[PDB]
Design an enzyme around this catalytic site. Structure first.
Site, mmCIF file in Angstrom:
data_model
loop_
_atom_site.group_PDB
_atom_site.id
_atom_site.type_symbol
_atom_site.label_atom_id
_atom_site.label_comp_id
_atom_site.label_asym_id
_atom_site.label_seq_id
_atom_site.Cartn_x
_atom_site.Cartn_y
_atom_site.Cartn_z
ATOM 1 N N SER A 11 0.823 -1.201 0.000
ATOM 2 C CA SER A 11 0.000 0.000 0.000
ATOM 3 C C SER A 11 0.858 1.252 0.000
ATOM 4 O O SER A 11 2.042 1.204 0.335
ATOM 5 C CB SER A 11 -0.932 0.028 1.213
ATOM 6 O OG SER A 11 -0.219 0.313 2.405
ATOM 7 N N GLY A 13 0.158 6.004 -0.314
ATOM 8 C CA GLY A 13 -0.811 7.084 -0.261
ATOM 9 C C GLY A 13 -1.731 7.048 -1.469
ATOM 10 O O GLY A 13 -2.849 7.560 -1.430
ATOM 11 N N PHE A 14 -1.252 6.436 -2.549
ATOM 12 C CA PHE A 14 -2.052 6.256 -3.754
ATOM 13 C C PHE A 14 -3.234 5.326 -3.479
ATOM 14 O O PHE A 14 -4.322 5.502 -4.042
ATOM 15 C CB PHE A 14 -1.191 5.665 -4.881
ATOM 16 C CG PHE A 14 -0.867 4.208 -4.691
ATOM 17 C CD1 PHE A 14 -1.690 3.221 -5.223
ATOM 18 C CD2 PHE A 14 0.241 3.826 -3.956
ATOM 19 C CE1 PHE A 14 -1.410 1.888 -5.028
ATOM 20 C CE2 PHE A 14 0.529 2.491 -3.761
ATOM 21 C CZ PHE A 14 -0.298 1.522 -4.296
ATOM 22 N N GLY A 15 -3.006 4.330 -2.619
ATOM 23 C CA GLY A 15 -3.959 3.253 -2.421
ATOM 24 C C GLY A 15 -3.340 1.942 -1.960
ATOM 25 O O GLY A 15 -2.235 1.921 -1.406
ATOM 26 N N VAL A 17 -3.103 -2.603 -2.539
ATOM 27 C CA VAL A 17 -3.200 -3.715 -3.479
ATOM 28 C C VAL A 17 -3.335 -5.029 -2.732
ATOM 29 O O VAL A 17 -2.537 -5.320 -1.838
ATOM 30 C CB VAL A 17 -1.959 -3.795 -4.393
ATOM 31 C CG1 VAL A 17 -2.139 -4.900 -5.426
ATOM 32 C CG2 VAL A 17 -1.727 -2.469 -5.083
ATOM 33 N N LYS A 32 -6.392 -3.697 -7.026
ATOM 34 C CA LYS A 32 -5.749 -2.425 -6.699
ATOM 35 C C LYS A 32 -6.757 -1.307 -6.460
ATOM 36 O O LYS A 32 -7.496 -0.907 -7.369
ATOM 37 C CB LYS A 32 -4.776 -2.023 -7.814
ATOM 38 C CG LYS A 32 -3.987 -0.738 -7.545
ATOM 39 C CD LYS A 32 -2.992 -0.474 -8.680
ATOM 40 C CE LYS A 32 -2.092 0.718 -8.383
ATOM 41 N NZ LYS A 32 -1.133 0.981 -9.510
ATOM 42 N N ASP A 132 8.259 5.151 -14.275
ATOM 43 C CA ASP A 132 8.692 4.644 -12.966
ATOM 44 C C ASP A 132 9.276 3.238 -13.091
ATOM 45 O O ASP A 132 9.020 2.364 -12.263
ATOM 46 C CB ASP A 132 7.533 4.687 -11.954
ATOM 47 C CG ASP A 132 8.005 4.581 -10.496
ATOM 48 O OD1 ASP A 132 9.188 4.876 -10.203
ATOM 49 O OD2 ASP A 132 7.178 4.205 -9.640
HETATM 50 C C1 LIG Z 1 3.244 -0.414 -2.848
HETATM 51 O O1 LIG Z 1 2.678 -1.584 -3.452
HETATM 52 C C2 LIG Z 1 2.182 -1.592 -4.752
HETATM 53 C C3 LIG Z 1 1.933 -0.422 -5.486
HETATM 54 C C4 LIG Z 1 1.422 -0.498 -6.788
HETATM 55 C C5 LIG Z 1 1.175 -1.735 -7.358
HETATM 56 C C6 LIG Z 1 1.425 -2.915 -6.627
HETATM 57 C C7 LIG Z 1 1.930 -2.883 -5.309
HETATM 58 C C8 LIG Z 1 2.215 -4.145 -4.531
HETATM 59 N N1 LIG Z 1 3.605 -4.809 -4.745
HETATM 60 C C9 LIG Z 1 4.080 -4.986 -6.159
HETATM 61 C C10 LIG Z 1 5.555 -5.505 -6.215
HETATM 62 N N2 LIG Z 1 6.474 -4.560 -5.509
HETATM 63 C C11 LIG Z 1 6.031 -4.431 -4.068
HETATM 64 C C12 LIG Z 1 4.590 -3.894 -4.037
HETATM 65 O O2 LIG Z 1 1.118 -4.025 -7.356
HETATM 66 C C13 LIG Z 1 0.631 -3.655 -8.616
HETATM 67 C C14 LIG Z 1 0.237 -4.515 -9.570
HETATM 68 C C15 LIG Z 1 0.211 -5.977 -9.570
HETATM 69 C C16 LIG Z 1 -0.408 -6.741 -10.547
HETATM 70 N N3 LIG Z 1 -0.261 -8.098 -10.267
HETATM 71 C C17 LIG Z 1 0.460 -8.236 -9.087
HETATM 72 C C18 LIG Z 1 0.857 -9.396 -8.409
HETATM 73 C C19 LIG Z 1 1.569 -9.221 -7.254
HETATM 74 C C20 LIG Z 1 1.857 -7.890 -6.829
HETATM 75 N N4 LIG Z 1 1.490 -6.764 -7.456
HETATM 76 C C21 LIG Z 1 0.776 -6.913 -8.611
HETATM 77 C C22 LIG Z 1 0.651 -2.150 -8.670
HETATM 78 O O3 LIG Z 1 0.310 -1.437 -9.592
#
Ligand SMILES: COc1ccc2c(c1CN1CCNCC1)O/C(=C\c1c[nH]c3cccnc13)C2=O
Length: 270
Positions: A11, A13-15, A17, A32, A132
């Site tokens: 997670s 501040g954006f949200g 997952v 998400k 990013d």
């Molecule tokens: C801070 O955590 C975030 C922020 C944005 C996204 C996100 C995550 C969770 N983790 C992702 C890997 N790096 C650590 C954080 O996941 C996303 C998409 C995903 C699509 N299929 C998945 C399967 C397993 C994890 N994430 C995803 C995102 O846009």
């Protein structure tokens, strides 16, 4: 009620997952949640509907197969959007992978970097700039040895003119952003790719502070071949126009004879 919700994956501040399962066919998904108040960058669907740019970008790239996470569906709520994304299993992100294994053998780094390059080329081809690219935003399908780009929440439509906004990761951002708050899409992407390749072969990023980024002096803390060092320093050229195109990166001598993804899995992941 269409998805069975599992544990929080991460997670900000954006949200937030969550791991999830599509009830109808037991497909693994990521769920998400994006807070409406934290979006900043709104896009519009063809049909005219204000959605996070992320949804626009994902639809532009979610088409056929690629090394980009697929958007399966999305929903709007009063105060948020909910995105349903593909979830490989088993999976590990590149940040965690490098944390556990340390600096990667160059044969493995070549395979991963090649796949990232193909994914980013696919994005730019589809008119999408990720903004990013970094280890945390790269998922590894451990069984298949396939990499997938995630999190287009900081992305934008690709254009040939200058960008003056940026909300990606600073330590992967180029000296022209640090100095002038201006960059062009492709050359900035190539810079972040230089940071990423250094990270793969050295096990950490080259620059921590603003002053290091603008000085652009690359020190190698691990043994790295001269060819790989050359490609890294080329991607990290201070002058944006001195950086290689995607074609020049993939034609670089260090990049030849890449492993197939399944070979990569069999040799390095199993
Ligand atoms: C801070 O955590 C975030 C922020 C944005 C996204 C996100 C995550 C969770 N983790 C992702 C890997 N790096 C650590 C954080 O996941 C996303 C998409 C995903 C699509 N299929 C998945 C399967 C397993 C994890 N994430 C995803 C995102 O846009």
């Amino acid at each position: 009620s269409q998805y069975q919700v599992g544990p929080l994956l991460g997670s900000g501040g954006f949200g937030s997952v969550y791991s999830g399962i599509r009830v109808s066919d037991n497909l693994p998904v990521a769920i998400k949640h994006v807070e409406k108040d934290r979006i900043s960058d709104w896009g519009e669907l063809p049909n005219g509907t204000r959605v996070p740019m992320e949804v626009v970008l994902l639809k532009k790239v979610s088409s056929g197969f690629s090394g980009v996470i697929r958007l399966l569906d999305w929903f709007e709520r009063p105060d948020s959007f909910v995105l349903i994304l593909e979830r490989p299993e088993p999976v590990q992100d590149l940040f965690d992978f490098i944390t556990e294994r340390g600096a990667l053998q160059e044969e493995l780094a070549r395979s991963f970097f090649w796949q990232v390059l193909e994914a980013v080329r696919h994005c730019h081809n589809c008119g999408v700039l990720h903004r990013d690219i970094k280890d945390e935003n790269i998922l590894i399908d451990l069984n298949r040895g396939e990499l997938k780009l995630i999190d287009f929440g900081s992305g934008a439509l690709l254009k040939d003119t200058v960008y003056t906004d940026f909300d990606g990761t600073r330590v992967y951002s180029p000296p022209e952003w640090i100095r002038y708050h201006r960059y062009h899409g492709r050359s900035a992407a190539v810079w972040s790719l230089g940071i990423l390749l250094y990270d793969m072969v050295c096990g950490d990023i080259p620059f921590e502070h603003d002053e290091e980024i603008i000085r652009g002096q690359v020190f190698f803390r691990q043994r790295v071949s001269s060819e790989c060092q050359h490609l890294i320093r080329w991607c990290l050229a201070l002058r944006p126009s001195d950086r290689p195109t995607f074609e020049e990166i993939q034609n670089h001598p260090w990049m030849q004879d890449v492993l197939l993804p399944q070979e990569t899995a069999e040799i390095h992941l199993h």
